[PDB]
Design a binder for this molecule. Structure first.
Ligand SMILES: [Zn+2]
Ligand SMILES: [Zn+2]
Lengths: 47, 17, 139, 66
């Protein structure tokens, strides 16, 4: 049950955007938004 | 993600105000 | 039964996702809420309609000033969406609500009514925002 | 962009001295005096406090939220 959460452009407010939907923020209303960091095991070697 | 209550977040009353 | 009555109970976490969605007076009108009166006693009330209060208050992250015209048998007054509790209808509160309904003369809603009304919230939750409602929401 | 942790050539820790270097330069001391006041003898470790550019500030100006 993952609705593909996004982060707004300028508001930096979380938004739930699903397929076949416009790409806009829940408030104000912009057209730019980025994704959130994956939940995978991001493990680096301090080399 | 329907209702992540886990109780709650201290619900205020009517007469308390 | 109280368990079957809690299916349509609109908790405080679900109401945060329909603060500006149209058709608010259609899907919400019919469900019951455990409004907190205030000490730990609660009273279930019927949702007659929707009102708008002149006081603006913040509820966690979001903030809404809309009211909720409720009624518990006969005693009616304006309430707010911030006093609603997330607890389920207890046996004592269930019996109190049943007694209040019986005293007020309002016929208890039939089981099929709740069965067909609980699907309204479910179908509204997965509603695709393809129409021109985002503009009104942001406004 | 940010002060390194160790001197590339020597290896001595220099990361824990940028703030002290700025403070000494602000109070009254000059560069040629502050460097040996901090304890930097070799000239290889002295470039880290003279050549380093502090660009992390400009980066922090673009705060994501608020
Ligand atoms: Zn927007
Ligand atoms: Zn060196």
């Amino acid at each position: 049950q993952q609705p593909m959460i996004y982060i707004c452009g300028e508001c930096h407010t979380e938004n739930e955007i699903k397929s076949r939907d416009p790409i806009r923020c829940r408030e104000c209303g912009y057209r730019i938004m980025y994704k959130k960091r994956t939940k995978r095991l991001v493990v680096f070697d301090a080399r | 993600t329907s209702t992540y209550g886990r109780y709650g977040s201290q619900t205020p009353m009517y007469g308390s105000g | 039964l109280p368990e079957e009555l809690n299916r349509v109970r609109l908790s405080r976490h679900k109401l945060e996702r329909w603060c500006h969605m149209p058709f608010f007076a259609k899907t919400v009108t019919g469900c019951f809420v455990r409004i907190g009166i205030g000490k730990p006693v609660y009273r279930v009330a019927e949702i007659t309609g929707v009102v708008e209060t002149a006081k603006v208050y913040q509820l966690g992250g979001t903030r809404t000033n809309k009211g909720l015209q409720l009624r518990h048998g006969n005693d009616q007054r304006v309430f707010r969406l911030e006093f609603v509790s997330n607890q389920e209808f207890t046996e004592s509160e269930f019996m109190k609500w049943k007694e209040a309904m019986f005293s007020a003369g309002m016929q208890l809603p039939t089981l099929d009514e709740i069965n067909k009304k609980e699907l309204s919230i479910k179908e509204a939750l997965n509603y695709k925002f393809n129409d021109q409602d985002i503009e009104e929401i942001v406004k | 962009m940010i002060i390194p942790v160790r001197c590339f050539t020597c290896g001595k820790i220099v990361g824990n001295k940028w703030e002290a270097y700025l403070g000494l330069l602000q109070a009254e001391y000059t560069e040629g005096d502050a460097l040996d006041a901090l304890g930097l003898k070799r000239y290889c470790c002295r470039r880290m406090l003279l050549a380093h550019v502090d660009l992390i500030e400009k980066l922090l100006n673009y705060a994501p939220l608020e």
